[PDB]
Design a protein around this ligand. Structure first.
Ligand SMILES: Cn1c(=O)c2c(ncn2C[C@@H](O)CN2CCOCC2)n(C)c1=O
Length: 500
């Protein structure tokens, strides 16, 4: 019968209800704000700040394709002028769009395959869907792309390694930038940063790329038909000191665990975990299509983080507040399909951001299963998840529950029962409740629940549970002969506590 166990989800904290009163939005040394805060009003398109385009071309800011420093050999010509000339043509067939993109990407004329674009346009879409694409959607995308200098007037700083910095920008500004990434206009981006240009989306056959493309065109059609009015904040968070996990005396927090539901639908207003690549968005602009790539597709404003977000180191995460959901889907990986356009129902905070907070935390990839029980590896995942959950200075009563699942399990070789407990300890140390989604795995739901209430009822601390993890390593893993250990973790823990 039971679809969920633990604390009712109804009892878990959510935004906007749990939220603090925001301070007044203003630019500071650690906060770039690219709109007129004095003019920000609900229901209105934000006005760019500053009024006129200003350009920075250096190793600390995005290199904009409209920069006068973006040049091409003729004698140097203006690549921006070349991009305008190339894109301001009728497209009536997919080859025309390919030829347009390649005019200002000449060096890539042999390297870049457009097969998936061609197949999408010619072999997947109806003839009428194809016509609307080239008569309406693509020309609207070109116009928003070419309005970049009027839209994104303020240089965008890179969120580089070890910076603690925020960028708050308009959904509209993001739309202009993404239209640019679609047409592959970002200069000098074709090694510590993810890909931003969409060229790999067009390559290969995969039955995946048609669905990706339908998802993204769903977005592009909405945002070029009617400008979104809200803001999005991107924050790199990078902590210096981590808890002494063996010494931590904090109690565990509440848990809700269910084998039904999704993070994005059932975890509304909660801190939603992106099971991320250390290059944020993973294979979204290429071949990947699991939890991260899906979220970045149905909430495409996430994709822009790849423009400015350097590869995460072990003490870092990215926190994105305000992204809007534009699509619904079914399936997963090879069965992923675009279903329909989604009308996002989320309330907006006082900064006109959708009350949707997503954190990218990258798990480690375990080639060998037992490697993850090594103390250094356990602490690594604890500290990564902790960094991702901690909101320094915010009271615990204003923290939403963490909405997560089997982080780093699947391709990355993570143990679901270990990672569940790791997230439970991280959350407790950050003083947040946990909402855990097992996606059909009803046994794992019982298991996590039973362990959680076992440790809670015996009032073990974070440190107590971590010491047990070390015991598991020392007795069952460190000198283990085989790929798998003699005794499984949860059974080991039960025996150890019931013995003592
Ligand atoms: C993280 N994640 C998933 O893993 C997922 C998902 N929809 C399906 N799956 C995959 C799991 O359902 C696969 N399990 C099935 C039951 O037990 C073994 C694997 N969704 C929507 C999701 O967000």
């Amino acid at each position: 019968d039971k679809k969920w166990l633990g604390t009712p989800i109804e009892e878990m904290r959510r935004m906007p209800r749990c939220g603090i009163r925001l301070p007044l939005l203003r630019p500071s040394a650690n906060h770039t704000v690219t709109i007129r805060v004095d003019l920000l009003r609900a229901g209105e398109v934000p006005k760019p700040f500053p009024t006129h385009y200003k350009d920075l071309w250096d190793n600390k800011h995005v290199k904009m394709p409209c920069s006068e420093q973006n040049l091409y050999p003729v004698t140097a010509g203006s690549r921006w002028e070349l991009i305008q000339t190339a894109l301001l043509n009728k497209f009536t067939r997919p080859q025309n769009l390919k030829d347009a993109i390649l005019k200002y990407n000449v060096a890539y004329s042999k390297k870049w395959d457009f097969t998936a674009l061609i197949d999408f346009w010619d072999k997947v879409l109806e003839e009428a869907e194809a016509q609307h694409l080239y008569q309406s959607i693509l020309p609207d995308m070109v116009k928003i792309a070419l309005c970049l200098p009027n839209i994104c007037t303020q240089p965008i700083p890179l969120l580089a390694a070890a910076m603690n910095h925020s960028i708050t920008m308009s959904q509209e500004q993001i739309a202009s930038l993404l239209a640019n990434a679609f047409f592959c206009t970002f200069p000098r981006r074709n090694s510590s940063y993810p890909d931003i240009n969409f060229n790999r989306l067009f390559e290969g056959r995969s039955s995946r790329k048609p669905e990706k493309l339908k998802t993204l065109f769903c977005y592009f059609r909405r945002v070029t038909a009617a400008a979104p009015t809200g803001l999005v904040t991107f924050t790199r968070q990078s902590l210096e000191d981590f808890p002494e996990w063996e010494r931590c005396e904090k109690p565990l927090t509440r848990l809700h665990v269910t084998y039904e539901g999704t993070i994005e639908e059932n975890g509304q207003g909660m801190l939603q975990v992106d099971f991320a690549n250390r290059f944020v968005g993973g294979g979204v602009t290429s071949a990947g299509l699991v939890q991260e790539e899906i979220r970045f597709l149905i909430n495409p404003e996430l994709i822009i983080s790849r423009l400015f977000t350097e590869v995460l180191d072990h003490n870092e995460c990215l926190i994105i507040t305000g992204t809007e959901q534009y699509s619904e889907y079914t399936g997963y990986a090879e069965t992923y399909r675009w279903s329909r356009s989604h009308e996002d129902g989320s309330e907006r905070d006082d900064w006109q951001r959708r009350c949707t907070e997503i954190v990218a935390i990258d798990a480690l990839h375990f080639r060998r299963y037992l490697d993850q029980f090594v103390p250094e590896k356990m602490r690594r995942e604890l500290n990564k998840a902790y960094c991702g959950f901690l909101r320094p200075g915010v009271s615990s009563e204003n923290l939403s529950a963490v909405a997560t699942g089997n982080w780093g399990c699947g391709a990355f070789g993570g143990d679901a029962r270990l990672k569940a407990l790791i997230q439970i300890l991280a959350a407790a140390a950050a003083e947040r409740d946990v909402v855990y989604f097992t996606f059909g795995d009803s046994e794992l739901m019982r298991d996590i629940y039973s362990m959680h209430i076992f440790l809670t009822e015996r009032k073990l601390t974070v440190g107590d549970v971590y010491k047990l993890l070390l015991r598991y390593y020392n007795e069952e893993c460190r000198n283990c002969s085989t790929p798998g250990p003699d005794i499984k973790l949860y059974p080991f823990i039960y025996h150890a506590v019931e013995s003592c």
